């Protein structure tokens, strides 16, 4: 009886939801294709109706006992509804939390950094600072952009993030989770046989295990980059120490892609770029997607439907309306699949087309599932399936048969590494960042790190795990892990770790079924229907089965495994190893760019304020009396390092408002001794 009642409830939910979520998603599409004041309010209206329905149904779902249900595809759907859609908060705390998140998003998105010679000139992150960090070679300009962002947006998000953490934990406990960090990783939890079970608190053990196995390769990549980078930024990088945070070619140091032009193995060897071939042969934006389709079809996957070809915005329409040029695949529901892109005839957007069609093939594969189960087995599978496809079509062998790469083109083992190195900077160089960012957040939500220790632990563990050091010291008025998109906007970041690991497990499995004989980095699953159909079986399951069993039937294992990643980059590893023979590999967490010239001193924030003011005072008089110079040093010009409360700290002083110009140790020491 109670199981049948649960089934009736779900039948009602699924049949009612299917033609309601459709309207909300359709309205969203129209808005992003045609941006207007009328379309935005219609988008919200449609969304509101769907949200209200979901909340009511989620609350109803709570009064069905899971122990009374003997069906797995029923119990699972009830669990999904019971643990979402309805927070347990006072109305005042529901108005508030939604007023901090909106505030943080806005502060990030409208944040700008001004110039210390000119105030009416301010650069924004998206059209501005981002194109400086990824191009400039000027140590001083890179420092300005790096520090300015964190000292402008970072200082605004600190008090908001503190309230955010407290309220989110209370919310998470309303679902019977220990904290919000625990809530986030519930997606990896599975129920079933003792052999196929997985606990949410197991993830924090497994990602650490994989990292330890990765590190030995990262250290070789790190050492190589350091010795090559040292020739671009001399006197700023130590042969035994950490890399400066602002010299990684990025605002956050998420990827090392932009260091390639500085750290390229074989500068005399060109990379493959068929942008010119595509233009010469008269390719358009449509042909790119037709070729992407052909690839998937050759391995036994379904053709793209007519609705896709007629409704998708594959190319920017020209004019008359503003569109959002941010590539993404859409599932509108009810057999309506689309891709939204502003496609250009380039190589980089060729690989992208393959990647976004990887999504749409997956979305089709599990379309037959119950509404609530129409998702990936795991959050990391959806991007593993998409990305594994871009590896097989980046191979010269594919371009040669396509006719994009010149006939009789010669390749060798000098250029395979030139290539793998570029990939390592994206795939390996990002893993320790993702790892420690999420690890820090978990500790913050859990309550292991007191508010007063947020910034001290952030940089402490970052130097230990990643091997990157700040150019200037930061106190607790800053919030570095808030000036990044995913942290400010409440997104989980672990999905960018596990998908990298799964991606290569899938890659190797596919290249094995396809009977590849040779290096793993030069495989191609095109024309291989035996590998394609095996993949399809793994996709069609959706979320109806636990990811552990879904993976096992495809990769013949259970836990995530980095083995395949280390093997993929094995060549490179054995090459870097023979290059780093005269250099030091690894780093020591006791060197800093500002530690060479500072004064050691041997008590709350109000006492430190007075101290810094006093130092600025001594400086003003020293310079005026000794060199007859009038320089107005302020409290903000005295930086404090290595604070060990009550007992000791280090400090140094810079010229007024000038970050790069540090007063020579013997000169500031003079000012202190003088007064």
């Amino acid at each position: 009886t109670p199981e049948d009642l649960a089934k009736i409830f779900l039948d009602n939910f699924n049949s009612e939801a299917e033609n309601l979520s459709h309207q909300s998603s359709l309205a969203s599409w129209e808005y992003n294709t045609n941006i207007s004041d009328e379309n935005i309010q219609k988008m919200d209206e449609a969304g509101a109706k769907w949200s209200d329905f979901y909340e009511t149904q989620s609350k109803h779902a709570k009064n069905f006992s899971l122990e009374e249900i003997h069906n797995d595809t029923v119990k699972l759907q009830l669990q999904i509804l019971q643990q979402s859609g309805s927070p347990v908060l006072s109305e005042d705390k529901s108005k508030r939390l939604n007023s901090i998140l909106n505030a943080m998003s806005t502060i990030y998105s409208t944040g700008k950094v001004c110039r210390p010679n000119n105030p009416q000139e301010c650069l924004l992150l998206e059209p501005g600072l981002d194109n400086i960090m990824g191009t400039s070679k000027d140590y001083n300009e890179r420092l300005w952009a790096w520090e300015g962002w964190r000292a402008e947006v970072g200082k605004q998000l600190r008090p908001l993030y503190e309230e955010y953490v407290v309220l989110k934990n209370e919310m998470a406990r309303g679902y019977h989770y220990e904290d919000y960090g625990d809530y986030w990783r519930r997606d990896y939890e599975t129920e079933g046989s003792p052999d196929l079970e997985y606990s949410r608190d197991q993830l924090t053990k497994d990602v650490e295990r994989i990292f330890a196995e990765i590190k030995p390769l990262y250290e070789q990549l790190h050492a190589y980059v350091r010795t090559k980078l040292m020739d671009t930024y001399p006197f700023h990088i130590s042969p035994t120490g950490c890399l400066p945070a602002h010299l990684l070619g990025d605002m956050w140091g998420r990827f090392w892609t932009n260091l390639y032009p500085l750290t390229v193995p074989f500068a005399q060897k060109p990379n493959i770029d068929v942008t010119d071939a595509m233009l010469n042969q008269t390719w358009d934006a449509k042909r790119i997607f037709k070729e992407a389709e052909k690839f998937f079809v050759s391995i036994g996957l379904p053709h793209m439907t007519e609705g896709f070809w007629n409704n998708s915005m594959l190319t920017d329409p020209g004019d008359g309306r503003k569109v959002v040029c941010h590539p993404t695949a859409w599932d509108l529901g009810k057999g309506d699949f689309r891709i939204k892109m502003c496609t250009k005839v380039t190589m980089e957007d060729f690989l992208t087309a393959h990647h976004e069609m990887g999504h749409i093939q997956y979305d089709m594969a599990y379309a037959s599932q119950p509404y609530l189960l129409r998702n990936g087995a795991n959050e990391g599978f959806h991007e593993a399936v998409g990305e594994v496809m871009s590896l097989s079509v980046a191979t010269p062998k594919h371009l040669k048969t396509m006719g994009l790469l010149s006939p009789d083109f010669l390749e060798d083992n000098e250029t395979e590494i030139n290539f793998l190195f570029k990939q390592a900077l994206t795939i390996v160089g990002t893993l320790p960042f993702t790892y420690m960012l999420e690890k820090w957040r978990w500790m913050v939500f859990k309550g292991e790190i007191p508010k007063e220790e947020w910034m001290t632990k952030w940089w402490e563990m970052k130097r230990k795990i990643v091997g990157v050091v700040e150019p200037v010291p930061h106190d607790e008025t800053y919030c570095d892990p808030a000036s990044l998109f995913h942290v400010a906007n409440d997104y989980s970041f672990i999905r960018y770790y596990t998908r990298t690991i799964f991606e290569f497990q899938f890659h190797e499995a596919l290249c094995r079924i396809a009977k590849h004989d040779g290096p793993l980095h030069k495989c191609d699953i095109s024309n291989s229907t035996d590998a394609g159909k095996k993949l399809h079986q793994m996709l069609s399951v959706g979320k109806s089965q636990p990811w552990t069993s879904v993976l096992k039937d495809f990769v013949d294992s259970k836990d995530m495994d980095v083995g395949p990643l280390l093997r993929y980059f094995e060549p490179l590893y054995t090459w870097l190893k023979e290059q780093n023979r005269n250099s030091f590999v690894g780093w020591n967490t006791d060197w800093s760019p500002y530690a060479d010239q500072s004064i050691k001193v041997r008590w709350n924030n109000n006492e430190m304020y007075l101290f810094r003011s006093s130092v600025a005072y001594a400086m003003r008089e020293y310079f005026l009396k000794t060199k007859n110079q009038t320089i107005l040093f302020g409290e903000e010009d005295v930086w404090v390092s290595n604070l060990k409360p009550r007992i000791s700290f280090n400090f140094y002083v810079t010229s007024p408002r000038n970050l790069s110009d540090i007063i020579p140790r013997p000169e500031v020491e003079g000012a202190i001794r003088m007064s």
């Binding site: 009736i8 459709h22 439907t305 609705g307 057999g335 309506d336």
Partner: protein
């Protein structure tokens, strides 16, 4: 007999409330001379080369995927609650895709999802009361267990071929 008022009709009814007209000269120029028009065409107990040598027509709008339920000895939401044919059925079922006509802004078609028991062959239930999942009747859909038995088809101009309206005509030869 006015086959043109069934096959060339400006509007069809919902599947939950199907209409039936009684059938003169038994012409077949609209059934077996143009078969490229129909997407589905199956006969039971009779062949296209035999029919030529009372026939009542039941017609309604149903989504593509549910067209397969319009047959003898079938089960499913439509077969069990909206439109049922007997196992011992003689006649033909014809259907065609009318996405360009029925999938508009104000065109709402309904089917029955919940009922206290299955319907008999050729039974037409057009009532509309709240369904109590625990048995009997109830009021207010806010109460757990109360559901509306009639739900719409989310037909729109751009949706999959399996969620596109089809016009079905069933010719039962008695």
């Amino acid at each position: 007999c006015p086959f043109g008022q069934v096959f060339n009709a400006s509007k069809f009814p919902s599947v939950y409330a199907w209409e039936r007209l009684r059938i003169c000269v038994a012409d077949y120029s609209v059934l077996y001379n143009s078969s490229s028009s129909f997407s589905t065409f199956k006969c039971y107990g009779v062949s296209p080369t035999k029919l030529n040598d009372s026939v009542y027509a039941d017609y309604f709008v149903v989504k593509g995927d549910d067209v397969r339920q319009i047959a003898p000895a079938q089960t499913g939401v439509i077969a069990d609650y909206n439109y049922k044919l007997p196992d011992d059925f003689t006649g033909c079922v014809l259907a065609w895709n009318t996405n360009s006509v029925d999938s508009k802004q104000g065109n709402n078609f309904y089917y029955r999802l919940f009922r206290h028991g299955k319907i008999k062959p050729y039974e037409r239930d057009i009532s509309n009361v709240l369904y109590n999942s625990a048995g009997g009747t109830c009021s207010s859909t806010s109460q757990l267990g109360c559901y509306e038995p009639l739900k719409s088809y989310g037909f729109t101009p751009t949706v999959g071929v399996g969620y596109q309206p089809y016009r079905v005509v069933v010719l039962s030869f008695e």
